[PDB]
Design a protein around this ligand. Sequence first.
Ligand SMILES: [Mg+2]
Ligand SMILES: [Mg+2]
Ligand SMILES: [Mg+2]
Ligand SMILES: [Mg+2]
Ligand SMILES: [Mg+2]
Lengths: 297, 296
Amino acid sequence: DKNIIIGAMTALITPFKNGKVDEQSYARLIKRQIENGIDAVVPVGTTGESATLTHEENRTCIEIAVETCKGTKVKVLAGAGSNATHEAVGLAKFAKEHGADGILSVAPYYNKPTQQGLYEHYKAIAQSVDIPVLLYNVPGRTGCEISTDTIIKLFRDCENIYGVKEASGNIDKCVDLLAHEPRMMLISGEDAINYPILSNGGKGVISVTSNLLPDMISALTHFALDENYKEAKKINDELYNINKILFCESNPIPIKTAMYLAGLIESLEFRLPLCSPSKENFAKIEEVMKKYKIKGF
Amino acid sequence: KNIIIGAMTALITPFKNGKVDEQSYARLIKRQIENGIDAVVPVGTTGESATLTHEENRTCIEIAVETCKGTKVKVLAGAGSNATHEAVGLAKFAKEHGADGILSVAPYYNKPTQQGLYEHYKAIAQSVDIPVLLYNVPGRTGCEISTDTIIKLFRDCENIYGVKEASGNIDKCVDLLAHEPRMMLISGEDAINYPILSNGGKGVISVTSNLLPDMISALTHFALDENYKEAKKINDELYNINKILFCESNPIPIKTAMYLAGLIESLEFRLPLCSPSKENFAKIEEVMKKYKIKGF
Ligand SMILES: [Mg+2]
Ligand SMILES: [Mg+2]
Ligand SMILES: [Mg+2]
Ligand SMILES: [Mg+2]
Ligand SMILES: [Mg+2]
C-alpha cells in the first residue's frame, strides 16, 4: 500500500573536528554502518545534534549520506523536523531535493501544540513532499505527546505518513497503536526495548547503540523480522547494559564518548550546550564497553 | 548588579493576514505602559518566538524599544536558543538594538547537562554587557536548571542577576533564596505570583497581564511594599483566570481572551499552534466575565 522505510536503522552521530563537521569521518562511519547490515541511516536526527548545526551543515550531512548509500540497498531517512510548521515544510522539501528516501520529523518541541495543531503540522509536511514521512514521538525531549488517535488519523489521512518512531518508554501505547491500526510501521526509538517493540509487531529500529555496535543491532532486528524471536531477545538482553549506559547522560553525549573510546572518531567534540561527560560517567561508559566486541572499519 | 524587576508582561504577538500586526503590537505595548507595567518581554514563549522569522523577531524587539523610550518601562528581550552560538548572536542582536536586558530560556529539546547549561549561559553573559535573566521552564524544555547551577551562574557572571521560574516548585524557590538571597527570583507562573513574591521574589513575567495589566501591576506593587494582605487578595481573585489561561498550551488561551476582549483584531496563530477547541473557547469567554478588562 504505502511506501515505507523499515528495518535496522542508525541515528548517526555527527563527528566534529576543530569545531567543524568531519566530512571524511562522517562518510567513513556511514560506510561502516552499511557494511554491518544496517538497512537505513538517519542523518541529523537528535543523535546527530541537529539543534546545533547550520543549515548548510545540515545539507552537507544529508548529501554525504545520500552519496555514501548510492549503489547499495541502504536508504537515507533524513532528520527533517522543527517546532515551526513553515520551517518543517521547508526542511522536508530540501531533504527531498537532496536525494533523501524519506524523512523523520520530530514532533514540535518547546511550544506544546495541541493534538489538533500536531495534526495540521504533519498534514502540511506530508502534503509538501512525495516521499515517506515517519512521525517521531519523544515527549521527554519535546514536552508534548502525539497521541495514538492523532498518529492513527495522520497515517490514515496522509498517503506518505507510514508509521512512528516511539521514544516514550510506554509499551502500553505500542500495544494501543498496533491493536487499532495494524497496518502502520511502529519503529523503536529506544534501544533497551527494541525487542519488546519488534515482538509486538514493530518493523524496525532507529538506534543509538548501532553507532557503536551496528552488527548486533542489525542481527537483533533481522532475527525479529524473520520471526526468530528467541535470537532477537538473546541479543536484546546482551545489549541491555550498553543500551542503558548510553543514556547515563543526555544522548548523544555517551555514544560520542563510546565512539571516541573505541577509536572510531578522532575527537570527543560537541557543540555547546552539549559537552563532555563527567569523569565518573566517562569511566562508567568505558567499563560497560569492556564486555562487547566493537567492530572497526 | 544591574537588574530589571517589578511587574512585567510576556507580550503576545498579534498576527493579521499571516503577518505581524505591527501597529497592533505597538498599541498593546502602550496599553501595558499605561496600566503600571514595569517591563515588557517581546518574543518570549507567549509571543510565539518559535514561529517568528529572524526579521520578525528584530521588528518586534525594535517596536518594543521604540515604544518604551521616554518612559521607565524596560525592554527585557526574549533571546535564547538551544544552540549556544545562536543564543549568543541573539543576545548581541538584542543589545545592539537597544533592549535593556535579555530573557534567555534554558536549551529546549537537546537536554544539556548542568555543566552544559553553565557553559551555555556563561557564553551568553560574556557576550553582552546588559542584564541576563535565566528562564527555567522544564515542562517545555525537558531540562531543569538546578539551584546549584543557577547560583553558580549568578555568582560567576556579572550580567546574570536572577531566574524566571515556571516550574510549580515552591521548594526550589525557597532553596534558591535561602542560599543566595541576592538574586532576583521572578515568577513565571501567574497562579503562584503571590507565593513567589511573598518569599522574596522581586517581580513577575506574566501571561495574565496581557489581559489584566492593572491587576497584575497592583498585585506586584502591593507585594513589593510588603502589603501582603492586598497582594494575596488580588492573587486569589485572579486564580480562576490565571488557571483558565492554561486550559490549552500558552499562548492559545491568552490570545483567545485578547481577541474576545476586542484587544486584537484576529484570532490567528502560526502552525503548529492553532485555535482552541469550541468548549475551551466557551470556557475562556465565561471566566473573563468576572474581570474588568481595561481597553486602550
Ligand atoms: Mg533540531
Ligand atoms: Mg527554528
Ligand atoms: Mg509604595
Ligand atoms: Mg505594611
Ligand atoms: Mg479566583
